[PDB]
Amino acid sequence: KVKKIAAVHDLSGMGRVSLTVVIPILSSMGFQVCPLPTAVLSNHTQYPGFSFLDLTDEMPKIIAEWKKLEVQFDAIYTGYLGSPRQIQIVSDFIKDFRQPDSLIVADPVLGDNGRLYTNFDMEMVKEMRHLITKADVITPNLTELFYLLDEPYKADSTDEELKEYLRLLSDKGPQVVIITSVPVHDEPHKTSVYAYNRQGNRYWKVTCPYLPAHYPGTGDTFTSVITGSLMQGDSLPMALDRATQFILQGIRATFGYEYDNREGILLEKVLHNLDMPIQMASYELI
Amino acid sequence: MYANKVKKIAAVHDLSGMGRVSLTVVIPILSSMGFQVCPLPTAVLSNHTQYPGFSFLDLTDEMPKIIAEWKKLEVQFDAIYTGYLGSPRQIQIVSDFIKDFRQPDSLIVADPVLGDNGRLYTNFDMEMVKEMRHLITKADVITPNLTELFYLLDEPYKADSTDEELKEYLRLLSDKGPQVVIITSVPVHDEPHKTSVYAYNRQGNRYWKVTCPYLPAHYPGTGDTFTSVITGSLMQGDSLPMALDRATQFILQGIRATFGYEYDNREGILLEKVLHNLDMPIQMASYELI
Amino acid sequence: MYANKVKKIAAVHDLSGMGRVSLTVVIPILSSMGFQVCPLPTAVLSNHTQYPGFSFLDLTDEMPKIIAEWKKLEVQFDAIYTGYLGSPRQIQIVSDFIKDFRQPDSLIVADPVLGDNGRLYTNFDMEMVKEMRHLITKADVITPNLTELFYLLDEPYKADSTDEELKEYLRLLSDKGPQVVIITSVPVHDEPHKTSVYAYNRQGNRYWKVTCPYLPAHYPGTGDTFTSVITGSLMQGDSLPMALDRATQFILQGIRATFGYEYDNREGILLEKVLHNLDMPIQMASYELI
Amino acid sequence: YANKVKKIAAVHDLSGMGRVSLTVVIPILSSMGFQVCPLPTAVLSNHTQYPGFSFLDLTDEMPKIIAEWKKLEVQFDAIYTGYLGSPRQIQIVSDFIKDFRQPDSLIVADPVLGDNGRLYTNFDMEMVKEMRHLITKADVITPNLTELFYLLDEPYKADSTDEELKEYLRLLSDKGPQVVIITSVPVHDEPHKTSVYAYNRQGNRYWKVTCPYLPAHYPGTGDTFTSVITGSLMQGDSLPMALDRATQFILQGIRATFGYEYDNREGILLEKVLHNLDMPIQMASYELI
Amino acid sequence: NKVKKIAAVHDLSGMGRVSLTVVIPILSSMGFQVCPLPTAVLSNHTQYPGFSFLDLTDEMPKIIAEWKKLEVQFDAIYTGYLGSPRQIQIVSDFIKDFRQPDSLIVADPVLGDNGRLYTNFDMEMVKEMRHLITKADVITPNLTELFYLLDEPYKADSTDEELKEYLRLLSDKGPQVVIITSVPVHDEPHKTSVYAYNRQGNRYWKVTCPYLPAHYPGTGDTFTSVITGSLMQGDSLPMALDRATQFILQGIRATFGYEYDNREGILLEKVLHNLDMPIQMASYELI
Amino acid sequence: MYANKVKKIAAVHDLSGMGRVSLTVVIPILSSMGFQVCPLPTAVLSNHTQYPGFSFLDLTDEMPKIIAEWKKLEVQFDAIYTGYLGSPRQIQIVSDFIKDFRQPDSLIVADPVLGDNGRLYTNFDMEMVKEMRHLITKADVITPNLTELFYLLDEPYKADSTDEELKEYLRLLSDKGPQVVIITSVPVHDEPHKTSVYAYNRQGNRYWKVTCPYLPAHYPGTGDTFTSVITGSLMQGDSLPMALDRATQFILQGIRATFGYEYDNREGILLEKVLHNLDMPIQMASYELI
Numbered sequence A: 001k002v003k004k005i006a007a008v009h010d011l012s013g014m015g016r017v018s019l020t021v022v023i024p025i026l027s028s029m030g031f032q033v034c035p036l037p038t039a040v041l042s043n044h045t046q047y048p049g050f051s052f053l054d055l056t057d058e059m060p061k062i063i064a065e066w067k068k069l070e071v072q073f074d075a076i077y078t079g080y081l082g083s084p085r086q087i088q089i090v091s092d093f094i095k096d097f098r099q100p101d102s103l104i105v106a107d108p109v110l111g112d113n114g115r116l117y118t119n120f121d122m123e124m125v126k127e128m129r130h131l132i133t134k135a136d137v138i139t140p141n142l143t144e145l146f147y148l149l150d151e152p153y154k155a156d157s158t159d160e161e162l163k164e165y166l167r168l169l170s171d172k173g174p175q176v177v178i179i180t181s182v183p184v185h186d187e188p189h190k191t192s193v194y195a196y197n198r199q200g201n202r203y204w205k206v207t208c209p210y211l212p213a214h215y216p217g218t219g220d221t222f223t224s225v226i227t228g229s230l231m232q233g234d235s236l237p238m239a240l241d242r243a244t245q246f247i248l249q250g251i252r253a254t255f256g257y258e259y260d261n262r263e264g265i266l267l268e269k270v271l272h273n274l275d276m277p278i279q280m281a282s283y284e285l286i
Numbered sequence B, C, F: 001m002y003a004n005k006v007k008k009i010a011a012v013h014d015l016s017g018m019g020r021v022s023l024t025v026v027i028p029i030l031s032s033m034g035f036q037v038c039p040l041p042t043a044v045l046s047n048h049t050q051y052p053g054f055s056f057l058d059l060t061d062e063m064p065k066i067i068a069e070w071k072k073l074e075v076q077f078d079a080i081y082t083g084y085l086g087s088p089r090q091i092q093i094v095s096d097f098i099k100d101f102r103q104p105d106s107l108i109v110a111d112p113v114l115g116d117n118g119r120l121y122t123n124f125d126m127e128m129v130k131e132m133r134h135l136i137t138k139a140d141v142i143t144p145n146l147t148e149l150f151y152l153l154d155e156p157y158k159a160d161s162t163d164e165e166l167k168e169y170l171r172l173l174s175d176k177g178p179q180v181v182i183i184t185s186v187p188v189h190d191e192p193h194k195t196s197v198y199a200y201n202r203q204g205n206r207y208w209k210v211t212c213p214y215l216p217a218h219y220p221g222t223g224d225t226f227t228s229v230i231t232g233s234l235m236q237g238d239s240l241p242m243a244l245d246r247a248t249q250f251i252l253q254g255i256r257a258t259f260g261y262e263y264d265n266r267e268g269i270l271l272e273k274v275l276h277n278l279d280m281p282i283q284m285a286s287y288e289l290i
Numbered sequence D: 001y002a003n004k005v006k007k008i009a010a011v012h013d014l015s016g017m018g019r020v021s022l023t024v025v026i027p028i029l030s031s032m033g034f035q036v037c038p039l040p041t042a043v044l045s046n047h048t049q050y051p052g053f054s055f056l057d058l059t060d061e062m063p064k065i066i067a068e069w070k071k072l073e074v075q076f077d078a079i080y081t082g083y084l085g086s087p088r089q090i091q092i093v094s095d096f097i098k099d100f101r102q103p104d105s106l107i108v109a110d111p112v113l114g115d116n117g118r119l120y121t122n123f124d125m126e127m128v129k130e131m132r133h134l135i136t137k138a139d140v141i142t143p144n145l146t147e148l149f150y151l152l153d154e155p156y157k158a159d160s161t162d163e164e165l166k167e168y169l170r171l172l173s174d175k176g177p178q179v180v181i182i183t184s185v186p187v188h189d190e191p192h193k194t195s196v197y198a199y200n201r202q203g204n205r206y207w208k209v210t211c212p213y214l215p216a217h218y219p220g221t222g223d224t225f226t227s228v229i230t231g232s233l234m235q236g237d238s239l240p241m242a243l244d245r246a247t248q249f250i251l252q253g254i255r256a257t258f259g260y261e262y263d264n265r266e267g268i269l270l271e272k273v274l275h276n277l278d279m280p281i282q283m284a285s286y287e288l289i
Numbered sequence E: 001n002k003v004k005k006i007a008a009v010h011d012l013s014g015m016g017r018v019s020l021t022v023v024i025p026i027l028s029s030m031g032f033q034v035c036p037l038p039t040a041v042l043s044n045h046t047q048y049p050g051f052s053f054l055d056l057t058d059e060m061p062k063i064i065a066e067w068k069k070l071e072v073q074f075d076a077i078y079t080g081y082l083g084s085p086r087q088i089q090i091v092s093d094f095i096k097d098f099r100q101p102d103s104l105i106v107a108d109p110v111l112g113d114n115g116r117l118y119t120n121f122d123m124e125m126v127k128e129m130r131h132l133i134t135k136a137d138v139i140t141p142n143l144t145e146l147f148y149l150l151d152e153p154y155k156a157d158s159t160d161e162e163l164k165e166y167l168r169l170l171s172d173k174g175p176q177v178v179i180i181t182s183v184p185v186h187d188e189p190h191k192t193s194v195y196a197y198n199r200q201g202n203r204y205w206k207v208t209c210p211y212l213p214a215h216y217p218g219t220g221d222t223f224t225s226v227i228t229g230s231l232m233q234g235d236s237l238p239m240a241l242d243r244a245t246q247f248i249l250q251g252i253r254a255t256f257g258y259e260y261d262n263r264e265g266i267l268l269e270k271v272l273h274n275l276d277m278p279i280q281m282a283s284y285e286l287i
């Protein structure tokens, strides 16, 4: 038996976002990914244009059959949703498919660089605020964090402010809260990730020398690796390390020739480096 | 100076939630072999069609919209690999896509997904067979199972054809276009737990055979697994006999991994448990038919 | 349709019987990494020149004869990788070889083999140094050790340069031709059991450093092992920092394999003992100097 | 305790193009875990089955290398000879074997002289005459069928019986080598196939294996063969196990060349199959009782 | 996260490669945990002229009692060389008490070879072994053991039809699957053969192999070990015959070409990694 | 000519029916690594002693009978590897066995099996500890856990030693005999779910450390798995740091294979699921304390 993950994400043909990242990563990590597609696109929405087909009306039809099949899922991992209407459907899906040992992961995909993704609006943000209440683990980037808390984007927070924000989000329900893409004061070529585990009341941080917002889909890569790592039995900080190192390699793999960063990290090139432990701890308790 | 990029494969297959078929097999296998899979989805299903029931959304109308964007982006594919299509109307779309995106060094692979166990898949009819006969004329490599071979040739299904009769069929299909033709799921003489594969390569005029101690028809999607491995193996520069070896070894490990406990075979081979074996040394399996 | 051949590397190095230097390192490493190595031998020796004595046969006058046959065969190289040369006359022969055999996608790698530990290798003098200064202008990637760096820049050897000064040396050398410059065997302040490697890529204008707990100068031919892994890794499409990690980790393993018994370090790293680890997942240690 | 990296002195030429001699011996034996220490016999641009080649005879340098090796006190676990640069090298290489063999050394001689019933380019009966001496100093010899007849001093015969083949093996073994292996034996009525025959004086056993390739089509196939045999033996494998590893590795390398325009003069695609050397093998060799 | 467990009811012998020192490495290598119920401790196998011997008859019920306290469950029970005739009742009760509906019960009815009982065995061990085999699903007598089990005189030359009969006569006693090893091959003194019957589908199989297993002590233990593992992995009976015979052939050939004391057994550890790969050329035949 | 046969290891451990300890771990591991394991059984037990109970048969009186037969056979062992002993009287038996069967090139490995979690194993007392102190003087490699270390040194258990203190413990034991001392199960400050291993080699004077994200004491028998891998790695000619890396990575894998479902940790690591990883390339983990 191979554990099954219901992945509630869009399918985009080009760019490395959503299902075309989730599927390869989590399959490589030993988990069967069962897609519940939210939308179909030619490519991600950080290109100038894209085709877009909303799958809101098909999703209950898929779920209906999954019930008929009596499929059990070990995890439900959500990301980019096709319409605000889908939060209700997904939230009911989690309600009806959760099990005592389910892992529920929500990447609250709303935007990056201080801005909502194309065509998203406050209806999506308000609904997503509900969706996170169903999850065990959430992975907002800094843009999403402030949309979720209904505050304005602020790039420069203290570590204590960041720990407050982590607690505020955990109070909405999730035991594990992870904030990605946090600027590093007076280090403009670095990013950091902050995490909180309610169980044991622990806070972590990792500094990593890349800028994920240059590469669409890095949140999907990050959260995919976090999901598989936790499901394999790694600790939260171990998971942070695996995810951040994997993304670092994927980003570095694009260096030294002309590259259109919109195509994403070079996933397939570095995919086999997931198959190893990180023999150097980079994480710290804060 | 030198560069050695990640190659892109356009994958023209459905997306199914449960079962291990189509994009949920093509994506993981080919990504693991080092290729970016770019999906051109043909349909969305709850699960594959050999379950008693399934949801279904035909993506025929969305396809040209995706393709027109890919033209805008100026994406170039090193290979196009087709399988399960959502309507007979898609054949013209996919044919035009192949025509407009193929490069001189492109690999075009068509798994002519029509049926298995001697019958068409749920809701497939002769119009889909008819159109599939045209699509395969566009491909460099085709991978019919035995049910599909007979539909392609417009002949009745026979489960006891001779070896030279099979070479005959391989040539007949090759003459319609494909340099490489592979026939999967050929029943065996006296061995009801075994199956076989036959192949022909117009380049060098060679014929191959492999014998397999498994019955792939018992596991929905094993043709998607087979052709994915074939496609990555050929793209890595392996010879046809090596590609046959890798595809059949992989499938064998995938099936044997289900043994030992109650298993619902409709869920497919245990892909994720054997996916890292794609890297390993491959035992020679195929042999030349002289 | 797909053609993806075994790439060929012309290896312009000596053949030494004992010790692990030059062709007896380049051939096994690059073959293991999937490349055919085609030797253009610069000299024949019984063993490397860091032993007290050695036989030596200069092959300068055979090299044009070999090049001439290669032209008649119409052989094409995907890369040209140079190292220890057998006389000062070879620099111009080799420069012409690169001129005539390079392609638009070629990778020209020159390890400017001149000396180590602050001294030239036995029988090298300033003529070899002055000529090598010319040859590096023709390369895409050069891999001097710290000694060779100061000989190339015509400045006195200095063991305590800053990161800032190493960045300036990298840039001065890149200004002479090479898009990628790697300086090996840099001492680490207050850490005498360690070595660092520094690199610059003019494309993207990035600087890298990696620190390792080994002393490469204790094991003759470690520059050949280093440069062979760098060449293979770049030809496989790895990024520069990934090449640096692969090369340094392989060498560390090769050094670690000699520990715990009486070993004559002049024999080199235990190459055969670690060769099958070239393939494996790597965790990154290289970091960007911003 | 220690279990070190064994060293093999490889007495072969260095050719730039084609997959023959040192450019085959070095990568195969290294991948199998042995340090190869070349004693080069000649330098060529390419193997001699191309229309032309450069050639530098290294006869005068070999004694200079051997002299340094004595001063270094280097010890070899094996000495593996193949293509030699002049008939004068037999004496040099024989004296090298005599002076560096230890009681447990493995001496392997591929008596490289020709193929397809003809001597290689510029070889003549002087090389054959001297090769007849060299084989008597070896523990293992690997002639192809052409070389077999030159060594025995009989006319080439394409169609011998298995019993005649057992006779030839025994006749060669009686000249010195415990193990005699004849490659490239035609298979009656199967023109797409080849066979290998072998004898081991230790245990008095005879082996045959039949394979679906034609090694003569790929220059250097004897060098791949004997390299894998040498490695297999040095790892402790039995003779029939070595015959199987060698023939299977070659078939994989030839199979790697199919289905695209390939210049077979370039050899088997060594790099493409090199990582298969160490995997489990099913045996096809069988004993001729 | 589960590995199937096999109770191995065999002796522990220091030197030679018999019994637990073959069963443990082979089955572990095939993915199963081997849990020993040791029948005896010896310095070496009993085809050497001398050996130490400690009978564990009295210890085995103590071990079984503890296994019941631990609530251990076995996927297979695989018996071989036993330390006294008294052990047969102990082992029968053990199978009775630990068999589950999906259990695979394998008995190698270890009694002798080369037409002779092993040292110190007599007709009491034979008589009890005839009982023990009635409890098994798969049995693997050599030809010597076959005739002892049948209470008929050893005969080196039987037709294939007699052999089919011998196979039925044993299946009648209980076992679904009966395999006879070390059968001579008429006119081929350097070969051996293995004959098998499956009451299911009523199928008879033969495989000829060019080795003489009686020259190497423990080849029965190797053979039955590989059969057990191969059956538990889901191979057919004939596939299992091929794997086991091929593995032994390699182990035997691994000893050729130098001074070797055959009493040390096949070179198991040398060829062990060849179990990891399927036989590509089947060599069994339906008879 | 070349002969290169199967090396034999005398394994002086108990045979336990259930649990993964002693001979039922030494035999599969070393056999898989290419070695013949010849057991000298110390005791027969139903199961290891960390279960709620066990049957126990002391083989002290049988061991001389076995040894006398082995002398008669003229058997020679390449290594002797000792672990759990059945009574204090066995140390003299075993010491005499090592004296009489060691050859100049033998490897003598002693796992000084006494206890864990700061307690002696069931029915062990100070007589066992005192005799074990003698036995380790005869070994080349010893592998105490931290509890065993303090018993061997006759000091009270303590959880928080500095690295300087651990290096001193390593010298104290190594100087009494063993060229190689390895201390396992050392707690990691502030990391309660991690463990550490420390080692010293007299040949080269190097001190090593490795940190692992597992708790070996949760899985009875992990010391036998550890020492078995150390033993086989060294006998294959690996260096000490490569042995440490292989042993720790094997145990990590074996522990991680138990995650995700209800598991009875008393059964040990999932040995058979990871046994085939032993021949994979392994990551460097161990590093020098300078």
Ligand SMILES: Cc1ncc(CO)c(C=O)c1O
Binding pocket: A010, A012, A017, A018, A041, A043, A044, A045, A046, A079, A080, A109, A117, A216, A217, A219, A220
């Ligand atoms: C379709 C689509 N899916 C997912 C993402 C990021 O998770 C993006 C981010 O740009 C997107 O456009």
Ligand SMILES: Cc1ncc(CO)c(C=O)c1O
Binding pocket: B014, B016, B021, B022, B045, B047, B048, B049, B050, B083, B084, B113, B121, B220, B221, B223, B224
């Ligand atoms: C939806 C769907 N897609 C693909 C396949 C087989 O290629 C099947 C086979 O059952 C299917 O149902």
Ligand SMILES: Cc1ncc(CO)c(C=O)c1O
Binding pocket: C014, C016, C021, C022, C045, C047, C048, C049, C050, C083, C084, C113, C121, C220, C221, C223, C224
């Ligand atoms: C002949 C010869 N060749 C190569 C090297 C180092 O690349 C050395 C370094 O000593 C040498 O002496």
Ligand SMILES: Cc1ncc(CO)c(C=O)c1O
Binding pocket: D013, D015, D020, D021, D044, D046, D047, D048, D049, D082, D083, D112, D120, D219, D220, D222, D223
């Ligand atoms: C130079 C050279 N060396 C070796 C060989 C064959 O081992 C040949 C076969 O043609 C050759 O030409």
Ligand SMILES: Cc1ncc(CO)c(C=O)c1O
Binding pocket: E011, E013, E018, E019, E042, E044, E045, E046, E047, E080, E081, E110, E118, E217, E218, E220, E221
């Ligand atoms: C003790 C012991 N155990 C088992 C066997 C053969 O299964 C033999 C065969 O001789 C033996 O002596």
Ligand SMILES: Cc1ncc(CO)c(C=O)c1O
Binding pocket: F014, F016, F021, F022, F045, F047, F048, F049, F050, F083, F084, F113, F121, F220, F221, F223, F224
């Ligand atoms: C019998 C027996 N043998 C060995 C060990 C651990 O090495 C233990 C640890 O509990 C044990 O109880």
Ligand SMILES: [Cl-]
Binding pocket: A255, A256, C201, C204, C206, C239, C240, C241
């Ligand atoms: Cl770079």
Ligand SMILES: [Cl-]
Binding pocket: C259, C260, F201, F203, F204, F206, F239, F240, F241
């Ligand atoms: Cl060390």
Ligand SMILES: [Cl-]
Binding pocket: B201, B204, B206, B239, B240, B241, D258, D259
């Ligand atoms: Cl082909």
Ligand SMILES: [Cl-]
Binding pocket: D200, D203, D205, D238, D239, D240, E256, E257
């Ligand atoms: Cl032999």
